Design an enzyme around this catalytic site. Structure first.
Site, mmCIF file in Angstrom:
data_model
loop_
_atom_site.group_PDB
_atom_site.id
_atom_site.type_symbol
_atom_site.label_atom_id
_atom_site.label_comp_id
_atom_site.label_asym_id
_atom_site.label_seq_id
_atom_site.Cartn_x
_atom_site.Cartn_y
_atom_site.Cartn_z
ATOM 1 N N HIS A 257 0.830 -1.218 0.000
ATOM 2 C CA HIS A 257 0.000 0.000 0.000
ATOM 3 C C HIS A 257 0.857 1.259 0.000
ATOM 4 O O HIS A 257 0.419 2.296 -0.475
ATOM 5 C CB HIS A 257 -0.964 0.087 1.209
ATOM 6 C CG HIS A 257 -2.240 -0.693 1.068
ATOM 7 N ND1 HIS A 257 -2.320 -2.058 1.251
ATOM 8 C CD2 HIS A 257 -3.500 -0.282 0.780
ATOM 9 C CE1 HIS A 257 -3.571 -2.455 1.088
ATOM 10 N NE2 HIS A 257 -4.306 -1.399 0.788
ATOM 11 N N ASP B 257 -4.027 -8.077 -6.880
ATOM 12 C CA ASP B 257 -4.335 -7.325 -5.668
ATOM 13 C C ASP B 257 -4.899 -5.978 -6.187
ATOM 14 O O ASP B 257 -4.884 -5.731 -7.410
ATOM 15 C CB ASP B 257 -3.108 -7.142 -4.780
ATOM 16 C CG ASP B 257 -3.458 -7.018 -3.281
ATOM 17 O OD1 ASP B 257 -4.648 -6.857 -2.873
ATOM 18 O OD2 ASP B 257 -2.493 -7.030 -2.496
#
Lengths: 447, 450
Positions: A161, A233
């Site tokens: 992230h 993802d």
């Protein structure tokens, strides 16, 4: 082509319904944005039950990542790894059974990443036995497992992230270790989807695995013989978005052999969608790959038809509401909300729910045993409880300006008798989904 | 005759050594789990694990949907009144959903549906509406894996009074009860759904002097004979004032069983010995016919056998239990007052550590430290350091290592690798920040680690 998309929903609203209806994504991921508001969640499930077939998934791994209050909280993979793997199977069967009953048909778990809380451990063999039991258990329970993150996210301390992580392992080391539980699972032929890692493996290839034709075609499809459903993802995560353009991520992932593009935000679907369509039209994406992808997705979609959908609750709430005729023109004004003081938690929730539908000027909490003090506003919502206790309470309610007051009779529906000639809504419930549905009715069918 | 526990259904508002003692001594056949347990998930899971090891139990909740909801696992429902406004099929679907979830957790009975007439927990005033929605409910629960218990026979709706406060009265004539209040009950009895029936602690003066729970006319003449229900009959909770302020325990027991009742519901497991001994007395002095106790035991055994389930969420307790590692601990330190060093906030888990510790240890203080800094120095008779990321740097690790080695216990609750950095120290490894894991670590500490 919506079928090559899996969209996360952190909210549910007319925008979400519009996106889903226009683009028809095949996959739905429900975020805490929705789950933490049970009325939204239930109404979302009802909506999905009416708009076709979806793969419906969560990130409820157990342990550290838990998003479904409906599943009992679990110590997690690390504690599980310490224990007879049958227990992991039982846990995932329980969890899956519950999920499936709610309307889920997929879970983004188990994590097969090696430990160097969400991991079963260091020992690749342990991770293999527990990951197999987990996939089988989830499946037995009624949900398709999605193993993650191929080829193994465990040997980097960095978070995808925040940046693009790096694992320096040689391919022979990945094969021997990180890839071993993935391999045992494919070799045992347990039904699963696979999620890719946004991680760079420099000793092997330049691209993040999500975008690496070498890691996905040569290693996952051919060497590992996995012909099933492959997901990214979430593409918006900075590991991808800060190093590649939307168009680059779309192209690489699909060319790499990927099937479904995971977006963490349904609002991003148009950009990405159009991007895909563009890359197909100017030939930068082999059409055969998109077709093979669509076929795989259609297989999973047909295979997933659930008999269970907790949105039935939304439905009941919807159909139990009664209203007198409402004047359309008042509904755009600012509302003063009269809410029984604190069944009490239901009352506490009314203002939040109202704010989704109407502008609110203030919230007044009245005593049910006295009734509302006098007040005025452009539009008044009186949430009536125990109006008939005596004549003084009842006249506290009836003194409000009949012209711009709506009485929501939310407990004893018989109080409705005491409001002739008034604007009246009967919910037959104090529960948030009922209030929510009553607002919808007010703006919708009641006018 | 060691089976008299089969005639008891007990409510548990707590789970603890007294609870295990009573359960193991008397073997009640029925367990009702109250919010006192359900609101503490570590307790709920540990209780389910205990139940899995101690024989066959009927396990129930009051999770009706709507106004009475006690299971956070079941999504919230508008309730019977809203449901009654809608196609009964939706009621069956909700009860199947709810039952499926309950059955997965380890429940096998629910004290629902309410078949009382409206005169929020009722489907409505119209007996036919109540009947169709009630049948749907029973069928749904049943399909889902839970045996419904319809309540409250013969119908509680026509009184304004509450059995927790006094003995209510319904003035309806029997011809009226038969036509109305009893119609939904009759609907269930004519089906093939297996069900239990719960009695109302209500007096019906036009019919009999006794509360229905204690009324031989209402339970034998009406329910057993006229209605032909040969299944399981339960009291509402006997401790309720409607009974307890008008009858002696001995009277409640005698009347209920002689009336044709099978299981006595207690809202407190701690009451089980009194009632239990009372039952035995009334059996030995002949004030209770043996045949009735025996028929009752037969019925309970049939229901028990009907429940053969594969699901029990207590496995979670088990996992938590087996993942705990500890160095050897000095038993003698454990009765001291404990100072708790708890990560400042997974975050909610940290918040819950003090509550759990308090069940097991006297607690002198609770100090919340910064994980990126470690604990300030402190002392106490016993110190529990709940260690998170001890390895960040040397300054943190030395914050943790500064604590008095003689009276500090290190709970390594996240990264178990930190364990290497506490040689010669008292160390417990949980592999989890979860309440059930911490709970189990305290158990192990007081148990197997010493």
């Amino acid at each position: 082509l919506g079928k090559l998309f899996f969209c996360g929903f952190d909210d549910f609203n007319e925008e979400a319904r519009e996106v889903i209806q226009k683009y028809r994504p095949a996959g739905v991921l429900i975020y805490p944005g929705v789950l933490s508001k049970e009325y939204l969640f239930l109404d979302f499930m009802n909506f999905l039950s009416r708009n076709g077939r979806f793969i419906v998934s969560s990130d409820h791994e157990g342990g550290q990542l838990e998003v479904l209050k409906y599943v009992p909280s679990f110590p997690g993979n690390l504690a599980a790894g310490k224990v007879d793997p049958v227990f992991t199977g039982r846990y995932c069967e329980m969890a899956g059974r519950i999920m499936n009953t709610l309307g889920f048909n997929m879970v983004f778990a188990p994590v097969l990443d090696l430990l160097s809380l969400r991991s079963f451990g260091s020992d690749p063999e342990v991770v293999a036995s527990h990951g197999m039991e987990a996939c089988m258990g989830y499946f037995k329970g009624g949900v398709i497992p999605c193993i993650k993150h191929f080829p193994g996210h465990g040997k980097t301390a960095d978070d995808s992230h925040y940046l693009l992580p790096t694992v320096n392992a040689s391919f022979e080391e990945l094969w021997r270790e990180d890839l071993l539980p993935f391999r045992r699972i494919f070799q045992s032929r347990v039904k699963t989807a696979v999620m890719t890692a946004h991680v760079k493996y420099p000793a092997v290839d330049d691209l993040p695995a999500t975008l690496s034709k070498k890691l996905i075609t040569e290693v996952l499809r051919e060497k590992l013989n996995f012909k099933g459903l492959v997901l990214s993802d979430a593409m918006e995560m900075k590991a991808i978005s800060e190093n590649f353009s939307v168009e680059e991520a779309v192209r690489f992932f699909i060319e790499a052999g990927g099937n479904m593009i995971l977006l963490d935000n349904f609002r991003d679907l148009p950009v990405y969608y159009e991007s895909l369509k563009k890359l197909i039209e100017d030939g930068s994406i082999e059409r055969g790959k998109v077709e093979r992808s669509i076929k795989i997705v259609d297989e999973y979609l047909s295979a997933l038809e659930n008999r269970f959908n907790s949105g039935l609750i939304a439905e009941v709430a919807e159909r139990a509401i009664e209203c007198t005729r409402m004047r359309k023109e008042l509904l755009g004004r600012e509302v003063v909300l009269l809410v029984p003081s604190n069944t009490g938690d239901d009352y506490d929730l009314i203002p939040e729910v109202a704010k989704r539908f109407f502008k609110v000027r203030d919230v007044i909490r009245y005593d049910i045993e006295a009734g509302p003090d006098d007040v005025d506003g452009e539009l008044i919502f009186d949430f009536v409880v125990n109006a008939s206790k005596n004549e003084q309470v009842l006249q506290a309610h009836l003194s409000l300006p009949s012209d711009r007051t709506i009485y929501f009779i939310i407990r004893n529906p018989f109080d409705a008798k005491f409001f002739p000639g008034r604007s009246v809504v009967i919910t037959h419930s104090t529960k948030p989904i009922s209030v929510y549905k009553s607002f919808q009715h007010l703006l919708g069918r009641c006018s």
